[PDB]
Amino acid sequence: FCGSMMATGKLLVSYAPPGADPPKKRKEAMLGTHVIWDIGLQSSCTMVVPWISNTTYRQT
Amino acid sequence: GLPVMNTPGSNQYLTADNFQSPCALPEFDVTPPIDIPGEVKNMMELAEIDTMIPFDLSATKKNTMEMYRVRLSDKPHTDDPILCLSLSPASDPRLSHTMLGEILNYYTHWAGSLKFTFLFCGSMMATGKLLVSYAPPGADPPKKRKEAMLGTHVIWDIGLQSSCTMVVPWISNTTYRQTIDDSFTEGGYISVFYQTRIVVPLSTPREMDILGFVSACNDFSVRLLRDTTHIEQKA
Amino acid sequence: GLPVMNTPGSNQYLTADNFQSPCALPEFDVTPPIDIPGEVKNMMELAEIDTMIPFDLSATKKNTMEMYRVRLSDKPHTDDPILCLSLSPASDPRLSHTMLGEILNYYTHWAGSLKFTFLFCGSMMATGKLLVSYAPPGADPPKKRKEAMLGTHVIWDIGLQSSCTMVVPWISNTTYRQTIDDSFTEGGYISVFYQTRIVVPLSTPREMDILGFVSACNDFSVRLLRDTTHIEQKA
Amino acid sequence: AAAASSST
Amino acid sequence: AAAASSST
Amino acid sequence: AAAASSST
Amino acid sequence: AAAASSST
Amino acid sequence: AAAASSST
Amino acid sequence: EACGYSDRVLQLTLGNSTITTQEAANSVVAYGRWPEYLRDSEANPVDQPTEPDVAACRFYTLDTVSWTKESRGWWWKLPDALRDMGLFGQNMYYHYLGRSGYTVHVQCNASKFHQGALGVFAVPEMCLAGDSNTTTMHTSYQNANPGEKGGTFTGTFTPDNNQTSPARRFCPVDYLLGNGTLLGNAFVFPHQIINLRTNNCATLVLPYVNSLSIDSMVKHNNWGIAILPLAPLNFASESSPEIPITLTIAPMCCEFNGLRNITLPRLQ
Amino acid sequence: AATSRDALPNTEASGPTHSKEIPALTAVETGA
Amino acid sequence: AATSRDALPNTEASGPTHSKEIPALTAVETGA
Amino acid sequence: GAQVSSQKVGAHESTINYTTINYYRDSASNAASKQDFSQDPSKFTEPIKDVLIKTAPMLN
Amino acid sequence: GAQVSSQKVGAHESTINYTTINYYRDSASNAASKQDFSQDPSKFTEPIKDVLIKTAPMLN
Ligand SMILES: *C(=O)CCCCCCCCCCCCC
Ligand SMILES: *C(=O)CCCCCCCCCCCCC
């Protein structure tokens, strides 16, 4: 987050494994893998996208 | 005399009390017991015995021998119910006068698992598969095999072992249910269906009867003794 | 029979008595307890919990959410009171309906130390120092910081720790006080003042609220159980 | 007590 | 007393 | 009890 | 008696 | 009983 | 902590969901009891329970509501507010019986120049009062269970009078906690306060509470979540400030008994 | 030795089955 | 001692969390 | 001659006891003890000459 | 089966006792003993996940 120190906010970062309608609304996005990021002193937030695959390797 | 102070309850007569009292025939020579067969120690022993369910209380069949017979036939497969029953062992008209139902009407509360056994009374040449279901309360009461299938059930295959038992497991929110029709303590739905169909050869009867029995499991109990509504003395 | 002599009190019914009596449902199968969360053993446990004081029972504010809010402002220093309160935990209108006040109206007598906690609900940019006072009874009730200062007090500095607690120590002639307005067992005066003043920067609200809570200390007790006046059944 | 009470 | 008084 | 019962 | 009469 | 019956 | 750690900064993870907060005021565990599964000694239904675990015991975010100078308060019931939430709602409607605990995370951030205080209360058996003065205990199931969107408090009791065709709904006056008791005493219930100068979230861990080990989740709500403005929203000098409040809730140690066909409730 | 007020039997945990034991099938003609 | 063809680290099982350890929050300004 | 027995305690406020003394010579005067025994239903539920094993075919 | 306990003596004229005997089989018939236990209010007054030290900052 590169806003000012006086700016606050909560954001949600999502990952949805394939196979359904790609999320277009927080409601859908919420149902999969996610992190609710709270903006504050720790400037940054990390979301891990876990290896979730049918195949052992994916194509590039 | 010893100083005493009468407390409340004094001189009253509680019909459920348990005190001593003077004997009117002192030193009476009591006739001893002999060892009569068939002694009972608890009313629940009687509830554990199978008794026949009057499934068909339809207007022309009720209060007659016909009420005990569920007629089946070799007709083509259908997903419609052979019979539907509410699990209200004391209040449902079909269970209320069975020995289990009768004992339950002397008590306010019941709890435990029940078991329904069905007997096929068709000919040896008749075959068939039926499905016996129990649906815990709270959804649409089953009207089609498809719904009924989703709950507790047994697929009965007709053969040498004449009969089949389905256990209705104790599944309740409350620790005890009431012996009356009551939504808060509703028990669910029993229903029977054709899995495949009854099949007979030629020269064989195409219709036949099944009979049903209910009894209590060893985990069944009752409490709060009460008067029954199954007898009265109008005047 | 054993010679006995009935003493006075015989056949009476004291509602506070403690005797045995015959059971109307013998051998009833009692449903066991489960471990429900939140068990209480003594009513004083509830008195030790903080509940919000309706400080402003002014005519337009009473019986509304506003009664709980003590409004402050960034106005210049004054030695005049923000609020004044009598230490009559059961009878003063501001304390009488708090959970402490409510429990106290089921008892005739109280004793122990109390504690008032105040919460500042202004913005983080607002600063200020306030003085919270307790004056034991017997003199002119404080109307100016100068008087209030001379008794038991706490100077509260507003900052990260949002709230401040002042303890009102048990200071009494009698061993217990009455749960009613009464001069012989009067408890004194609680009052709040501005030590310096509330200061805000620009672009900041100049008025804000504080909230107050009361709870009992571990040395607090009550006695002589009685009916409350906080409920009735006219007809 | 022994004595407590006589018994029969 | 010992005997108690029977106990169950 | 022995003493507690005095007896006569 | 000893046993039970319990005492507290 | 011994104890519990206190005596004075 | 000399190596960094603090009361105000938490990370909660349940299932595939993680919440972070840098401005908490600790966490509350209701009555000091952490959610748990039903013990054999306390068990009642004899059938093998369904335990959805990560599929249902994760964080569901409900619809964000908006706090303003005129807001009087909001309420929700559990499990009702989660009845349509993914695999939790499905397991709920397929079974006769169910039990669950919850982690409730209320989210409301603002700025160093705003002010205001929200009281967040978890009430066991939160029976609310109806809108009628001619009949009692008459709010309809549909009106009593708003689902995820919840309901709201009013500052004024205004009695439904259409006697011919009654509203049949709650009329919860804020200073009476919608139930005839004074709001100032709701602090005897498990709670937290979101005071904008101090914190931006409230976190409550709620055990399963009831007079039964397990019950009908469709018929009965175990907990009520009540959020009321203890001190009104205020900012700089704007007469109409607004800030969002978001509710995220996670079922915890939830288990279900009595499987059958799905319950299709008439909710309108 | 079992008394009228002793607790009833505990339910025991049981899992899936695929065997020749047939508890469910019986013959009431026997009188049992 | 780790060679280019050694297998990579195993994923370890991990459960629910409610604590003050904050893996997810960081500050990339540090250069890490 | 006092008889001490224990109560099966329902809702609680060690084992609790109660005391009984018979005042009359005739046992018919005695109250009911309620200290009763249970039996198993076999003689009614399974009166068959050959013992039944529930997992095996009732008829073989 | 008698039960002997001591009275917490208020205004005085060794420990003084009183005696109780249960006459009924059902524990519901029993009087109330009033021999009750106290608990500490923690679960209501301090339901917080992290133990609080009163001399230290509630928030740190
Ligand atoms: C066994 O009973 C020895 C202890 C006796 C205890 C006192 C009995 C109380 C009075 C009983 C008198 C009997 C009346 C027929
Ligand atoms: C334990 O109780 C042994 C001592 C008995 C003392 C005498 C009891 C007084 C009469 C009690 C009769 C009980 C009435 C149901």
mmCIF file of C-alpha atoms and ligand atoms in Angstrom, chain D residues 5, chain E residues 4, chain L residues 1-2 21 23, ligand 1:
data_model
loop_
_atom_site.group_PDB
_atom_site.id
_atom_site.type_symbol
_atom_site.label_atom_id
_atom_site.label_comp_id
_atom_site.label_asym_id
_atom_site.label_seq_id
_atom_site.Cartn_x
_atom_site.Cartn_y
_atom_site.Cartn_z
ATOM 1 C CA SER D 5 -30.432 -52.559 71.629
ATOM 2 C CA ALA E 4 -28.716 -52.789 64.216
ATOM 3 C CA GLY L 1 -32.962 -51.549 63.435
ATOM 4 C CA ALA L 2 -32.624 -48.505 61.143
ATOM 5 C CA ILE L 21 -37.431 -47.675 60.300
ATOM 6 C CA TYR L 23 -42.719 -49.531 63.131
HETATM 7 C C1 LIG N 1 -32.803 -50.038 65.340
HETATM 8 O O1 LIG N 1 -33.938 -49.628 65.079
HETATM 9 C C2 LIG N 1 -32.028 -49.458 66.509
HETATM 10 C C3 LIG N 1 -32.051 -47.935 66.502
HETATM 11 C C4 LIG N 1 -33.387 -47.336 66.986
HETATM 12 C C5 LIG N 1 -33.381 -45.847 66.616
HETATM 13 C C6 LIG N 1 -34.505 -44.986 67.212
HETATM 14 C C7 LIG N 1 -35.865 -45.428 66.661
HETATM 15 C C8 LIG N 1 -36.866 -44.250 66.620
HETATM 16 C C9 LIG N 1 -38.142 -44.586 67.384
HETATM 17 C C10 LIG N 1 -38.656 -45.942 66.873
HETATM 18 C C11 LIG N 1 -39.769 -46.458 67.775
HETATM 19 C C12 LIG N 1 -40.438 -47.578 67.010
HETATM 20 C C13 LIG N 1 -41.944 -47.356 67.018
HETATM 21 C C14 LIG N 1 -42.713 -48.705 66.882
#
